[PDB]
Structure 1
Amino acid sequence: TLTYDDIVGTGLANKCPTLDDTARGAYPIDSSQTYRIARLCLQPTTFLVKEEPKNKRQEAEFVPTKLVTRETTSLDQIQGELKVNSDGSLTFVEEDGIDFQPVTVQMAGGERIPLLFTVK
């Protein structure tokens, strides 16, 4: 574990935790025991912006873009119940947390494309 000071300024604070190469197991679900997600976390790696095919509809694709703001992208502290369903499936239901971050990326042209990257 590292204290605040052990992270401050490294940018490490905007990174969801990681599991080692080992941890490739399996977790059990009691289906008779409620479960919740104590901490969901999402870290962006890429932001692609589908381009408008001009008038000539020719099918448009997504293109990479430069992150003009900085390392403020990550969503963290997400939480909610992970109810088990009758058919034995699982559906997560978020309640609260840093569930959104305003991001801004530039493009080929120089156009800044702001988005409210979220999962509310």
Structure 2
Amino acid sequence: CPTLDDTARGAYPIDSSQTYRIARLCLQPTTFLVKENGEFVPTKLVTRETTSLDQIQGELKVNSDGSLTFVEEDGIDFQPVTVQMAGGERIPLLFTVKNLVASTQPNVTSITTSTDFKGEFNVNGTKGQISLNVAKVDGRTGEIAGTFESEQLSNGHEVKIQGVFYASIEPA
């Protein structure tokens, strides 16, 4: 995924008289865990081409409590991946955030390094959950970066996926 400038600093103010969007969201997985014996255990990513989701975008709606809700409306939000268990089994997994709806804490006055987005998405007839932890904000450009963790059910396996993300926020 893209990265922020070395000098990225400061919060990104949100003007309540304006509306905003996520123009781009990129998820780069660093971690695929598969449940075995009730434990999420690590696997090796075997797919050597791009495994990121990117170009994800959509409105940021304002709720009555001042939180923002991201409604995913487009993007490369689905990627088939193959991982390999320690014992050698190669499992195809579906990495996705399709139909993501994720909200911040209340009373949004600015996007900061303590902003979180939490919500749910659809994986071919079941729900997944995801948390985005913003870790860095460029207040000048609207670029943000952080880490994510999702849980879902792809191909008869309960799967956790973790990694890094980049996004850009801008007025509508």
State the TM bucket, normalised to the shorter chain.
0.7 to 0.9
1:46-104 residue CA offsets vs partner (Å, 9 max, x unmatched): 1111xxxxxxx997221111111113210000010011222010110011111110011
Structure 1 residues 84 and 58: alpha-carbon distance in aligned structure 2, compared to 1, 3 A threshold:
closer
Query: Which residue pairs with 1:46 in the alignment?
Result: 31
How much does 1:110 deviate?
Answer: 1.0
* Higher fraction of strand: 2
Change (3 A) 1:59 1:105: closer
Q: Percent identity?
A: 96
Root-mean-square deviation over aligned CA pairs: 2.1
Question: Which gives a bigger RCO, structure 1 or 2 (Cα 8 Å, sep 6+)?
Answer: 2
Instruction: Tell me the distance in 2 between the aligned counterparts of 1:66 and 1:59.
Output: 18
Report the alpha carbon displacement of residue 21 of structure 1 after superposing the two structures with TM: 4.8
1:32 offset after TM fit, Å? Answer: 1.9
Alignment partner of 1:44: what SS? Answer: strand
Task: Write out aligned runs for 1:67-106 (5 A).
Answer: 67-106=45-84
In the alignment, which residue of structure 2 is the partner of 1:11?
none
Match of 2:19 among 29, 34, 43: 34
Q: Which has the larger radius of gyration?
A: 1
Structure with bigger helix share is: 1
Q: Distance in 1 between matches of 2:65 and 2:13?
A: 16
**Structure 1's 107 and 26: CA in aligned 2 closer, same or farther, altered over 3 A?**
same
Matched pairs, number: 98
- Residues 58/107 of structure 1: CA separation in 2 closer, same or farther (3 Å cut): closer
Deviation of 1:31 (Å): 1.7
Deviation at 1:22, TM superposition (A): 3.3
Q: Deviations over 1:13-57 (max 9, x none)?
A: xxx1111453241111112211111111111111111xxxxxxx9
Gaps of 5+ in 2: 99-172
